[PDB]
Every structure is written in C-alpha cells, then in structure tokens.
mmCIF file of C-alpha atoms (C1' of nucleotides) and ligand atoms in Angstrom:
data_model
loop_
_atom_site.group_PDB
_atom_site.id
_atom_site.type_symbol
_atom_site.label_atom_id
_atom_site.label_comp_id
_atom_site.label_asym_id
_atom_site.label_seq_id
_atom_site.Cartn_x
_atom_site.Cartn_y
_atom_site.Cartn_z
ATOM 1 C CA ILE A 1 10.139 5.416 14.060
ATOM 2 C CA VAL A 2 9.038 6.874 17.623
ATOM 3 C CA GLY A 3 9.278 4.926 19.720
ATOM 4 C CA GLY A 4 9.013 1.215 19.438
ATOM 5 C CA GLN A 5 11.641 -1.001 19.273
ATOM 6 C CA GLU A 6 13.488 -2.687 16.929
ATOM 7 C CA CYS A 7 12.315 -5.808 14.507
ATOM 8 C CA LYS A 8 14.226 -8.371 15.394
ATOM 9 C CA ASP A 9 15.276 -10.770 12.773
ATOM 10 C CA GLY A 10 12.574 -12.279 10.995
ATOM 11 C CA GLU A 11 10.500 -10.272 12.487
ATOM 12 C CA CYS A 12 9.282 -7.817 9.658
ATOM 13 C CA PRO A 13 10.127 -9.849 6.501
ATOM 14 C CA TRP A 14 7.734 -7.541 4.573
ATOM 15 C CA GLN A 15 9.547 -4.447 5.169
ATOM 16 C CA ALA A 16 10.696 -3.098 1.586
ATOM 17 C CA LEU A 17 13.065 0.395 2.299
ATOM 18 C CA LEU A 18 13.955 2.782 -1.309
ATOM 19 C CA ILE A 19 17.112 3.789 -1.472
ATOM 20 C CA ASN A 20 18.279 6.867 -3.956
ATOM 21 C CA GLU A 21 21.219 7.058 -6.147
ATOM 22 C CA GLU A 22 23.677 7.844 -3.078
ATOM 23 C CA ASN A 23 21.908 4.500 -1.720
ATOM 24 C CA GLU A 24 20.069 6.329 1.350
ATOM 25 C CA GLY A 25 16.702 5.633 2.302
ATOM 26 C CA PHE A 26 14.284 7.720 2.019
ATOM 27 C CA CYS A 27 10.532 5.816 1.993
ATOM 28 C CA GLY A 28 9.785 2.354 3.183
ATOM 29 C CA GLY A 29 7.220 -0.138 0.854
ATOM 30 C CA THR A 30 5.995 -3.570 1.606
ATOM 31 C CA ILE A 31 6.189 -6.377 -0.099
ATOM 32 C CA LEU A 32 3.392 -8.558 -2.030
ATOM 33 C CA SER A 33 4.417 -10.961 -3.093
ATOM 34 C CA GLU A 34 8.365 -11.753 -5.723
ATOM 35 C CA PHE A 35 7.692 -9.252 -8.646
ATOM 36 C CA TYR A 36 5.562 -6.848 -6.601
ATOM 37 C CA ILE A 37 5.743 -3.896 -3.933
ATOM 38 C CA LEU A 38 3.281 -1.830 -1.961
ATOM 39 C CA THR A 39 4.291 1.748 -1.087
ATOM 40 C CA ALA A 40 3.017 5.318 -1.556
ATOM 41 C CA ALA A 41 2.473 7.722 -4.573
ATOM 42 C CA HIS A 42 3.775 10.998 -2.717
ATOM 43 C CA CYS A 43 7.388 8.652 -2.079
ATOM 44 C CA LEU A 44 7.824 9.239 -6.020
ATOM 45 C CA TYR A 45 8.183 12.494 -5.750
ATOM 46 C CA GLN A 46 11.411 12.520 -3.553
ATOM 47 C CA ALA A 47 14.457 10.633 -5.067
ATOM 48 C CA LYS A 48 15.673 11.334 -8.936
ATOM 49 C CA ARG A 49 15.783 7.596 -9.122
ATOM 50 C CA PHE A 50 15.296 4.903 -6.671
ATOM 51 C CA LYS A 51 15.716 0.967 -6.062
ATOM 52 C CA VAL A 52 14.435 -0.966 -3.691
ATOM 53 C CA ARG A 53 15.812 -3.123 -0.933
ATOM 54 C CA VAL A 54 14.786 -5.601 1.087
ATOM 55 C CA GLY A 55 15.591 -7.812 3.592
ATOM 56 C CA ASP A 56 18.274 -4.877 5.959
ATOM 57 C CA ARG A 57 17.827 -4.538 9.114
ATOM 58 C CA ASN A 58 20.974 -2.425 10.159
ATOM 59 C CA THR A 59 22.077 -0.381 7.598
ATOM 60 C CA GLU A 60 25.259 0.575 9.242
ATOM 61 C CA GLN A 61 26.617 -3.429 9.216
ATOM 62 C CA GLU A 62 25.804 -4.727 5.349
ATOM 63 C CA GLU A 63 26.243 -7.964 5.746
ATOM 64 C CA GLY A 64 24.410 -11.245 5.323
ATOM 65 C CA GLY A 65 21.320 -11.902 2.955
ATOM 66 C CA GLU A 66 20.461 -7.558 1.457
ATOM 67 C CA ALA A 67 19.283 -7.244 -2.470
ATOM 68 C CA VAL A 68 18.079 -4.879 -4.148
ATOM 69 C CA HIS A 69 16.191 -4.784 -6.688
ATOM 70 C CA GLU A 70 15.657 -2.598 -10.366
ATOM 71 C CA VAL A 71 12.554 -1.054 -10.676
ATOM 72 C CA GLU A 72 11.115 -1.913 -14.135
ATOM 73 C CA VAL A 73 7.278 -0.516 -13.656
ATOM 74 C CA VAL A 74 5.441 2.102 -11.475
ATOM 75 C CA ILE A 75 2.430 2.105 -10.505
ATOM 76 C CA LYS A 76 0.686 5.291 -9.494
ATOM 77 C CA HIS A 77 -2.538 6.191 -8.748
ATOM 78 C CA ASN A 78 -4.097 8.528 -11.313
ATOM 79 C CA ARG A 79 -6.129 10.594 -8.308
ATOM 80 C CA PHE A 80 -3.115 10.271 -6.353
ATOM 81 C CA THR A 81 -2.857 14.714 -5.377
ATOM 82 C CA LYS A 82 0.070 16.216 -3.080
ATOM 83 C CA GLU A 83 -3.181 19.435 -1.723
ATOM 84 C CA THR A 84 -4.247 16.994 -0.279
ATOM 85 C CA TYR A 85 -2.247 13.340 -0.471
ATOM 86 C CA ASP A 86 -5.472 11.495 -0.863
ATOM 87 C CA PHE A 87 -5.120 8.237 -3.361
ATOM 88 C CA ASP A 88 -2.344 8.083 -1.237
ATOM 89 C CA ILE A 89 -1.177 4.480 -3.359
ATOM 90 C CA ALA A 90 1.701 3.219 -6.310
ATOM 91 C CA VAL A 91 2.748 -0.218 -7.160
ATOM 92 C CA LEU A 92 5.994 -1.491 -7.798
ATOM 93 C CA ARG A 93 6.576 -4.091 -10.617
ATOM 94 C CA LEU A 94 10.486 -4.952 -10.161
ATOM 95 C CA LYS A 95 12.716 -6.464 -13.018
ATOM 96 C CA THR A 96 13.942 -9.103 -10.841
ATOM 97 C CA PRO A 97 11.808 -11.985 -9.098
ATOM 98 C CA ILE A 98 12.685 -11.548 -4.785
ATOM 99 C CA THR A 99 13.626 -14.555 -3.663
ATOM 100 C CA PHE A 100 11.969 -15.664 0.137
ATOM 101 C CA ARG A 101 14.510 -16.356 2.443
ATOM 102 C CA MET A 102 14.705 -14.814 6.123
ATOM 103 C CA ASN A 103 13.694 -11.144 6.377
ATOM 104 C CA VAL A 104 12.330 -11.762 2.925
ATOM 105 C CA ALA A 105 8.739 -12.700 2.743
ATOM 106 C CA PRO A 106 5.273 -10.966 2.141
ATOM 107 C CA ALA A 107 2.444 -9.632 3.901
ATOM 108 C CA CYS A 108 -1.322 -10.647 3.491
ATOM 109 C CA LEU A 109 -3.608 -9.513 1.083
ATOM 110 C CA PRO A 110 -7.005 -9.374 2.830
ATOM 111 C CA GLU A 111 -10.435 -9.671 1.170
ATOM 112 C CA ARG A 112 -12.146 -6.173 2.054
ATOM 113 C CA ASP A 113 -15.392 -7.086 3.798
ATOM 114 C CA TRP A 114 -13.681 -9.486 5.565
ATOM 115 C CA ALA A 115 -10.791 -6.525 6.070
ATOM 116 C CA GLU A 116 -13.565 -4.191 7.086
ATOM 117 C CA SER A 117 -15.313 -6.824 9.221
ATOM 118 C CA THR A 118 -12.167 -8.099 11.321
ATOM 119 C CA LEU A 119 -8.818 -6.492 11.008
ATOM 120 C CA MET A 120 -9.342 -2.054 11.005
ATOM 121 C CA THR A 121 -11.865 -3.711 13.715
ATOM 122 C CA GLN A 122 -8.750 -4.806 16.057
ATOM 123 C CA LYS A 123 -7.019 -2.803 19.371
ATOM 124 C CA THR A 124 -4.573 -2.233 16.698
ATOM 125 C CA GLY A 125 -2.379 -2.572 13.528
ATOM 126 C CA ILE A 126 1.801 -2.483 13.938
ATOM 127 C CA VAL A 127 4.071 0.572 11.787
ATOM 128 C CA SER A 128 7.296 -0.142 10.798
ATOM 129 C CA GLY A 129 10.175 1.721 9.048
ATOM 130 C CA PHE A 130 13.960 3.192 9.193
ATOM 131 C CA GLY A 131 12.648 6.541 9.515
ATOM 132 C CA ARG A 132 13.343 9.024 12.017
ATOM 133 C CA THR A 133 13.010 8.884 16.292
ATOM 134 C CA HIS A 134 12.266 12.265 16.537
ATOM 135 C CA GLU A 135 10.747 14.459 14.312
ATOM 136 C CA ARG A 136 17.220 12.415 11.094
ATOM 137 C CA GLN A 137 16.587 8.044 9.425
ATOM 138 C CA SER A 138 17.149 5.141 12.353
ATOM 139 C CA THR A 139 20.697 2.443 11.251
ATOM 140 C CA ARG A 140 17.641 -0.173 12.288
ATOM 141 C CA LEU A 141 14.767 -0.402 11.098
ATOM 142 C CA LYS A 142 11.510 -0.441 13.945
ATOM 143 C CA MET A 143 8.028 -1.537 14.610
ATOM 144 C CA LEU A 144 5.378 0.234 16.099
ATOM 145 C CA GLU A 145 2.516 -0.790 17.746
ATOM 146 C CA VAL A 146 0.119 1.505 16.356
ATOM 147 C CA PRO A 147 -4.346 1.604 17.995
ATOM 148 C CA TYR A 148 -6.321 2.385 15.481
ATOM 149 C CA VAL A 149 -8.301 5.818 16.097
ATOM 150 C CA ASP A 150 -11.973 6.636 15.085
ATOM 151 C CA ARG A 151 -12.413 8.882 11.873
ATOM 152 C CA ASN A 152 -13.962 11.392 14.210
ATOM 153 C CA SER A 153 -11.720 11.819 16.942
ATOM 154 C CA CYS A 154 -8.792 11.676 13.686
ATOM 155 C CA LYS A 155 -10.818 14.637 11.074
ATOM 156 C CA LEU A 156 -12.018 16.664 14.743
ATOM 157 C CA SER A 157 -7.785 16.717 15.397
ATOM 158 C CA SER A 158 -6.524 16.866 11.422
ATOM 159 C CA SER A 159 -5.279 20.466 9.913
ATOM 160 C CA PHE A 160 -6.441 18.419 6.553
ATOM 161 C CA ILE A 161 -9.178 17.074 5.433
ATOM 162 C CA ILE A 162 -9.491 13.206 5.840
ATOM 163 C CA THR A 163 -10.588 11.150 3.318
ATOM 164 C CA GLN A 164 -12.068 7.621 2.677
ATOM 165 C CA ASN A 165 -9.202 6.883 1.263
ATOM 166 C CA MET A 166 -7.316 7.754 4.981
ATOM 167 C CA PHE A 167 -7.250 5.871 8.978
ATOM 168 C CA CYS A 168 -5.993 7.108 11.828
ATOM 169 C CA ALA A 169 -3.451 5.827 13.820
ATOM 170 C CA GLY A 170 -1.426 6.138 16.507
ATOM 171 C CA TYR A 171 -1.853 8.587 20.401
ATOM 172 C CA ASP A 172 -3.115 11.545 21.144
ATOM 173 C CA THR A 173 -0.437 12.095 23.814
ATOM 174 C CA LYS A 174 1.730 9.197 24.015
ATOM 175 C CA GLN A 175 5.580 9.438 21.867
ATOM 176 C CA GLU A 176 4.844 7.221 19.896
ATOM 177 C CA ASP A 177 4.655 7.621 15.790
ATOM 178 C CA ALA A 178 5.637 7.058 12.735
ATOM 179 C CA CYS A 179 7.839 10.150 11.488
ATOM 180 C CA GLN A 180 9.283 11.288 7.979
ATOM 181 C CA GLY A 181 11.432 8.797 6.577
ATOM 182 C CA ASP A 182 8.463 5.073 7.380
ATOM 183 C CA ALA A 183 6.120 7.529 4.641
ATOM 184 C CA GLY A 184 5.412 3.925 1.871
ATOM 185 C CA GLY A 185 5.913 1.257 4.315
ATOM 186 C CA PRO A 186 3.855 -2.054 6.132
ATOM 187 C CA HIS A 187 0.850 -1.016 8.705
ATOM 188 C CA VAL A 188 -0.348 -4.533 8.740
ATOM 189 C CA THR A 189 -2.712 -6.186 11.045
ATOM 190 C CA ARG A 190 -1.752 -9.612 12.297
ATOM 191 C CA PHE A 191 -5.051 -11.767 13.117
ATOM 192 C CA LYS A 192 -4.492 -15.376 14.316
ATOM 193 C CA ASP A 193 -0.484 -14.966 14.244
ATOM 194 C CA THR A 194 -0.821 -13.863 10.527
ATOM 195 C CA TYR A 195 -0.144 -10.058 9.337
ATOM 196 C CA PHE A 196 -2.329 -8.603 6.586
ATOM 197 C CA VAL A 197 -1.559 -5.244 4.877
ATOM 198 C CA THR A 198 -4.315 -3.225 5.994
ATOM 199 C CA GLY A 199 -2.010 0.257 5.586
ATOM 200 C CA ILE A 200 0.694 2.450 4.379
ATOM 201 C CA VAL A 201 2.468 5.146 6.091
ATOM 202 C CA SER A 202 1.209 8.353 4.155
ATOM 203 C CA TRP A 203 1.791 12.127 6.490
ATOM 204 C CA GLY A 204 1.206 13.444 10.262
ATOM 205 C CA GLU A 205 1.408 16.885 11.049
ATOM 206 C CA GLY A 206 5.459 15.982 12.408
ATOM 207 C CA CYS A 207 5.527 13.042 14.327
ATOM 208 C CA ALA A 208 4.284 11.876 17.974
ATOM 209 C CA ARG A 209 2.652 16.649 18.528
ATOM 210 C CA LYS A 210 0.222 16.098 21.313
ATOM 211 C CA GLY A 211 -3.667 16.009 19.939
ATOM 212 C CA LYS A 212 -2.318 14.598 16.240
ATOM 213 C CA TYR A 213 -1.672 10.939 15.061
ATOM 214 C CA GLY A 214 -0.784 9.081 12.475
ATOM 215 C CA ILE A 215 -2.454 9.460 8.550
ATOM 216 C CA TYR A 216 -2.534 6.044 6.774
ATOM 217 C CA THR A 217 -3.278 5.396 3.284
ATOM 218 C CA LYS A 218 -6.487 2.926 3.656
ATOM 219 C CA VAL A 219 -5.398 -0.597 1.635
ATOM 220 C CA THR A 220 -8.982 -1.730 2.536
ATOM 221 C CA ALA A 221 -9.876 0.893 -0.451
ATOM 222 C CA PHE A 222 -7.399 0.468 -2.425
ATOM 223 C CA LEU A 223 -7.480 -4.001 -2.663
ATOM 224 C CA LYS A 224 -9.095 -3.837 -6.407
ATOM 225 C CA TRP A 225 -6.944 -1.322 -7.454
ATOM 226 C CA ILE A 226 -4.016 -2.603 -6.519
ATOM 227 C CA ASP A 227 -5.379 -6.951 -7.824
ATOM 228 C CA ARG A 228 -5.630 -4.614 -10.840
ATOM 229 C CA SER A 229 -2.592 -3.298 -10.578
ATOM 230 C CA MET A 230 -0.737 -6.784 -10.057
ATOM 231 C CA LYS A 231 -1.786 -7.646 -13.356
ATOM 232 C CA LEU B 1 -21.894 -16.898 12.207
ATOM 233 C CA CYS B 2 -18.497 -14.847 10.826
ATOM 234 C CA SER B 3 -18.626 -12.643 14.198
ATOM 235 C CA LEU B 4 -18.753 -15.655 16.667
ATOM 236 C CA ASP B 5 -14.768 -15.995 16.883
ATOM 237 C CA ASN B 6 -14.044 -15.989 13.092
ATOM 238 C CA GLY B 7 -16.670 -18.466 12.260
ATOM 239 C CA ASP B 8 -13.958 -20.897 13.503
ATOM 240 C CA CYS B 9 -12.001 -19.779 10.425
ATOM 241 C CA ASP B 10 -7.675 -19.147 10.844
ATOM 242 C CA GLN B 11 -8.559 -16.370 8.139
ATOM 243 C CA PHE B 12 -11.094 -15.412 6.340
ATOM 244 C CA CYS B 13 -15.315 -15.832 7.003
ATOM 245 C CA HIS B 14 -17.971 -15.355 4.610
ATOM 246 C CA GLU B 15 -21.752 -15.553 5.451
ATOM 247 C CA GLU B 16 -22.985 -17.844 3.308
ATOM 248 C CA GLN B 17 -26.574 -19.506 2.733
ATOM 249 C CA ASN B 18 -26.724 -18.921 7.337
ATOM 250 C CA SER B 19 -23.681 -20.481 7.282
ATOM 251 C CA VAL B 20 -20.227 -19.342 7.697
ATOM 252 C CA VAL B 21 -17.508 -20.015 4.835
ATOM 253 C CA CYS B 22 -14.171 -20.553 5.200
ATOM 254 C CA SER B 23 -11.577 -18.997 2.441
ATOM 255 C CA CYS B 24 -7.051 -18.162 2.773
ATOM 256 C CA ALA B 25 -5.095 -16.492 1.580
ATOM 257 C CA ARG B 26 -2.842 -16.873 -1.548
ATOM 258 C CA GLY B 27 -0.244 -18.994 -0.490
ATOM 259 C CA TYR B 28 -2.794 -20.913 1.755
ATOM 260 C CA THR B 29 -4.314 -24.683 0.982
ATOM 261 C CA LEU B 30 -7.702 -24.455 3.292
ATOM 262 C CA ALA B 31 -7.378 -27.722 5.443
ATOM 263 C CA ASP B 32 -9.436 -30.708 5.895
ATOM 264 C CA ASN B 33 -11.252 -29.523 8.057
ATOM 265 C CA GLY B 34 -12.512 -26.861 6.504
ATOM 266 C CA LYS B 35 -11.889 -24.631 8.457
ATOM 267 C CA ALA B 36 -7.744 -23.717 9.589
ATOM 268 C CA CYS B 37 -4.922 -22.105 5.694
ATOM 269 C CA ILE B 38 -2.141 -24.178 5.259
ATOM 270 C CA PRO B 39 1.221 -22.836 3.764
ATOM 271 C CA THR B 40 2.141 -24.535 0.654
ATOM 272 C CA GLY B 41 5.189 -23.708 0.488
ATOM 273 C CA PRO B 42 8.260 -22.447 2.830
ATOM 274 C CA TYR B 43 7.863 -18.764 2.656
ATOM 275 C CA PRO B 44 3.425 -17.927 3.377
ATOM 276 C CA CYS B 45 2.100 -14.450 3.047
ATOM 277 C CA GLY B 46 2.411 -12.806 6.562
ATOM 278 C CA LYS B 47 4.562 -15.372 8.451
ATOM 279 C CA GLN B 48 7.336 -13.929 10.322
ATOM 280 C CA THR B 49 10.483 -15.928 9.151
ATOM 281 C CA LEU B 50 12.471 -17.935 11.376
ATOM 282 C CA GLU B 51 15.497 -19.534 8.996
ATOM 283 C "C1'" G C 1 -28.489 1.715 -8.562
ATOM 284 C "C1'" A C 2 -28.135 4.305 -13.995
ATOM 285 C "C1'" G C 3 -27.037 7.820 -18.244
ATOM 286 C "C1'" A C 4 -24.527 10.792 -19.412
ATOM 287 C "C1'" G C 5 -20.528 15.201 -19.815
ATOM 288 C "C1'" C C 6 -16.007 16.917 -18.432
ATOM 289 C "C1'" C C 7 -11.002 15.915 -15.162
ATOM 290 C "C1'" C C 8 -7.290 12.039 -14.840
ATOM 291 C "C1'" C C 9 -4.529 7.956 -16.466
ATOM 292 C "C1'" A C 10 3.628 6.100 -14.080
ATOM 293 C "C1'" G C 11 -0.366 -0.361 -15.585
ATOM 294 C "C1'" C C 12 -2.330 -3.298 -21.164
ATOM 295 C "C1'" G C 13 -3.457 -1.008 -26.685
ATOM 296 C "C1'" A C 14 -1.530 3.082 -30.129
ATOM 297 C "C1'" G C 15 2.156 6.376 -30.656
ATOM 298 C "C1'" A C 16 6.343 9.931 -30.412
ATOM 299 C "C1'" A C 17 16.096 12.856 -25.324
ATOM 300 C "C1'" A C 18 12.936 5.785 -22.114
ATOM 301 C "C1'" A C 19 5.551 12.447 -14.235
ATOM 302 C "C1'" C C 20 6.469 11.685 -22.076
ATOM 303 C "C1'" G C 21 -6.731 8.030 -24.858
ATOM 304 C "C1'" G C 22 -9.195 1.842 -27.800
ATOM 305 C "C1'" C C 23 -9.526 -0.599 -22.747
ATOM 306 C "C1'" C C 24 -9.546 -3.320 -16.974
ATOM 307 C "C1'" C C 25 -8.445 -0.227 -11.887
ATOM 308 C "C1'" C C 26 -10.467 4.943 -10.438
ATOM 309 C "C1'" G C 27 -12.592 10.672 -9.268
ATOM 310 C "C1'" C C 28 -15.721 14.270 -9.831
ATOM 311 C "C1'" C C 29 -24.874 16.380 -14.059
HETATM 312 O O1 LIG D 301 5.259 11.430 7.553
HETATM 313 C C1 LIG D 301 5.335 11.742 8.022
HETATM 314 N N1 LIG D 301 5.323 12.945 8.524
HETATM 315 C C2 LIG D 301 6.531 14.236 8.338
HETATM 316 C C3 LIG D 301 6.526 15.195 7.809
HETATM 317 C C4 LIG D 301 5.864 14.510 6.461
HETATM 318 N N2 LIG D 301 5.241 16.581 7.256
HETATM 319 C C5 LIG D 301 3.279 16.641 6.167
HETATM 320 C C6 LIG D 301 3.538 16.073 4.087
HETATM 321 C C7 LIG D 301 2.323 16.399 4.301
HETATM 322 C C8 LIG D 301 1.126 17.055 4.624
HETATM 323 N N3 LIG D 301 0.103 16.707 3.766
HETATM 324 C C9 LIG D 301 -0.994 16.483 4.453
HETATM 325 C C10 LIG D 301 -2.510 15.864 3.569
HETATM 326 O O2 LIG D 301 -1.953 17.440 1.938
HETATM 327 C C11 LIG D 301 -0.901 17.606 1.812
HETATM 328 C C12 LIG D 301 -0.383 17.465 3.380
HETATM 329 O O3 LIG D 301 0.943 18.164 2.628
HETATM 330 C C13 LIG D 301 1.103 17.107 6.047
HETATM 331 C C14 LIG D 301 2.279 16.370 6.913
HETATM 332 C C15 LIG D 301 4.850 16.530 7.759
HETATM 333 O O4 LIG D 301 3.742 17.737 8.766
HETATM 334 O O5 LIG D 301 5.754 16.030 8.353
HETATM 335 C C16 LIG D 301 4.554 11.220 9.722
HETATM 336 C C17 LIG D 301 3.985 10.690 10.145
HETATM 337 C C18 LIG D 301 3.077 9.501 10.933
HETATM 338 C C19 LIG D 301 3.493 9.098 9.216
HETATM 339 CL CL1 LIG D 301 1.376 7.868 9.776
HETATM 340 S S1 LIG D 301 3.764 10.115 8.035
HETATM 341 CA CA1 LIG D 302 21.976 -4.443 6.766
HETATM 342 NA NA1 LIG D 303 0.521 12.175 19.074
#
RNA sequence: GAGAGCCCCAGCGAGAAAACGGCCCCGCC
C-alpha cells in the first residue's frame, strides 16, 4: 500500500497473505469463511506453490496468533485472461478450518442488488495489504481509504480495457494507492460498522501515478460465482 | 423506502409489496424489531476484532 | 429474454509424474 496507515490491532482481520516456498508474501487474500479465501486469479501465476497465512500484522516479528493453512482446492474463474486481467478472481478452499480469533475474522458477502445500490454508491472503500509502499514490500499490514471513481473517468484514464468485471478506486494525483504485492487482497466497504467485500485488488499501471487509478475486480458481478465456488 | 436511510435496516434492505424488508448476512440473526442484525457467535463477519 | 453454434472448464462427475466434458456457476449466430 502506498500512503494510508497501519492496520492496528484487530482492524483488518479478514486480510490473508499468500506466501510462496521461501515464506515470502506475494499476494493478498480475503477470508470469507473458516474454509474459504477470496483472491485474484492472476495471483495463481506468481508462485510455483503457496500457502495462506492469516492473523499476521508484522512479518518481521513472527510471534503471536499467526497461522499458515495449506490449500486443498484452487477454484480459478474459467474465464480469467492475463491479456486483459478480466475475470480476475479465484477462491481457495483450505485443508484445515481457520479458528477465528483476534486479527482473524471473515468479511461479509453482501447481497448483490443491495451491494450495487448501497455499498458501491458510498464515497469510499478500504483496501489493505502487505505490498509495496511505493512503485519493495511492507513488513507491516497497511490499510487505505480509496474513493470510488466513476467508470467513464476510469476508462478515459486507462491504457487497458476496463470491463464490467472491474472498477476504479483511489486518487487522480494524490500519492495513495494499492501496489505490487497487494493483489488478491480485500477491498471492503463499511456500512454501519460492518465491512462487506466489494472488490479484489487486481491491477494498476504502476502505483499512485498521476491520472491513473487502482483497478479492482468488481465482486458484485461474482457473488453468484462465489456462492457456487463455496459449494 | 430502502433509499430513505436504508429503510432503517442494519444491513440488507429490500422493497417488497410496497414495504421495507430487512435482512442480515450469514452469522447474524434479525432482531425482534425486524431491522437490527445480531451476531450469533463471537466472530461475526465484517466486524473488527477486540479480544 | 429464448435457441442454436463454438470457446472455456484449477468446482461436482468420469478418466489417465496430483494450470493433467454428463452437471452447477460463467463467456463469446
Ligand atoms: O499490482 C499493481 N500494480 C503493480 C504492477 C502490476 N502492473 C500491471 C499488471 C498488469 C496490467 N495489465 C492490465 C490488464 O491487462 C493485463 C495487464 O498486463 C497492467 C499493470 C503494473 O503496471 O505494475 C496495482 C496497482 C494498483 C492496484 Cl489496485 S493493483
Ligand atoms: Ca507477525
Ligand atoms: Na493516481
């Protein structure tokens, strides 16, 4: 995350970290249930093999309530393409159930129509992760408030096609954005002190560049696919 | 209805037979008042953790 | 909306050194 703040104790308990063979974090995830993690499809092409860490906040100091879960099942969206990053979504089923505790709790899946009318129409959402702090990876979990950006502005701003499975969030010139390493992580929207999954960190042209935004997988278009993928 | 302050619902609001209907995400129960959402267990979805 | 042709299919099926088309989600006359 570029700019933003640290996640303080218990503030981002739905954050998951995908970790490769050398225990290096490379992508984020969002805890949905005891067995299921939401992530980006393109994150499945970064590491040879990986596990999911949850309940982590400072990677440098591994003492506390962190736990690494092995992935039983990967459920990538059949329509994902790396040429466009369209359908940038996957669901991981874990071999072992997550024990919810301090810093380990799922984000809520909203109903679609309500999500569209009530969450997507909010001023801002919250993105989080362990990724780089400029365009390089944070040792501490960070969060950032990102304004929703209208589709027409987003499309004009972009060098790549913005599909209906994507939305923009962040700032025109202000040096705040997600970055490399945050992909697959949570974009959640707050409504009366309850946080609902609204996006997946997908891609951006660099990080915090002027006249560019963060591109997120529009979770509302995938709520049905998610339900299916959670059995 | 649902455009007037979410129909007074804590979470989901839907318009049904000219009337508001509130509902809640899995892991919540609808309160007696038909509007508030009540956690069933200690770690309900979407809540920042305190202990 | 519907029907069809194809494309996709790391989920449930089936099969053959564990990203290798019957069904759920899903795309493109
Ligand atoms: O990971 C990010 N970017 C870091 C890196 C990744 N990246 C980047 C990666 C892919 C694509 N795209 C665009 C979609 O078609 C395929 C493709 O190739 C564009 C940019 C880039 O230019 O820098 C992000 C920045 C903001 C958000 Cl939100 S995610
Ligand atoms: Ca730690
Ligand atoms: Na920007």
